[PDB]
């Protein structure tokens, strides 16, 4: 129920399902962006995953245990978005991040645009470690999207 | 509302991947509710 990997986050009522996001299972903990689940519980097969840690300002939440993803963008190298878009299999997209310059420091940011239900897809370093999650960002003047590389603290 | 998860793959770097996107340098602000906004 908590096997390592990337997962779709789905919702259903009485009819079909909608993909609202994506997340990462690592070390028994499920990691996603807060705006995907609004911090509500998740079903995994016949099991229930309860929220454990989260932070709306970071737009992150973890289930079953504390945040486990510790790898950091090195501030230099190309990265890969492992995008899991609604209705499409996972795909890797390589990019050189730009930068969100904030009063509190710089954050890597990727100029890659996917449907909203791709939120929570992991961004990877060359060793395959998850350096953050995709899906909290800004829309620039021409309507295109730039996502922070959002990482928590382990 | 039934919110549930389903496995979608392994987490692996792809060798010889397609490279796309620019590297924008943007001034942003982050509010207490987690919204990023461009500084105008």
């Amino acid at each position: 129920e908590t096997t390592d990997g990337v997962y779709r986050v789905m919702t259903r009522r009485l009819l079909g399902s909608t993909q609202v996001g994506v997340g990462v299972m690592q070390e028994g903990v499920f990691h996603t962006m807060w705006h995907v689940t609004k911090g509500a519980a998740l079903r995994s097969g016949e099991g229930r995953l309860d929220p454990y840690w989260g932070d709306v300002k970071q737009d992150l939440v973890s289930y079953c245990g504390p945040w486990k993803l510790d790898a950091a963008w090195d501030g230099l190298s190309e990265v890969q978005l492992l995008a899991v878009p609604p209705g499409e299999r996972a795909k890797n997209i390589q990019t050189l991040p730009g930068i969100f310059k904030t009063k509190d420091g710089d954050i890597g940011a990727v100029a890659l645009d996917y449907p909203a239900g791709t939120s929570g897809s992991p961004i990877l370093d060359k060793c395959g470690r998850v350096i953050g999650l995709y899906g909290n960002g800004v829309v620039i003047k021409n309507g295109s999207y730039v996502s922070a590389i959002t990482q928590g603290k382990r | 509302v039934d919110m549930y998860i389903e496995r979608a793959g392994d987490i692996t770097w792809e060798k010889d991947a397609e490279v796309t996107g620019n590297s924008p340098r943007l001034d942003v602000a982050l509010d207490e509710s987690g919204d990023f906004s461009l500084v105008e």
Binding site: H35, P115, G117, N136, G137 | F36
Partner: peptide, 4 residues
């Protein structure tokens, strides 16, 4: 974004 189909900002989030």
């Amino acid at each position: 974004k189909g900002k989030r």
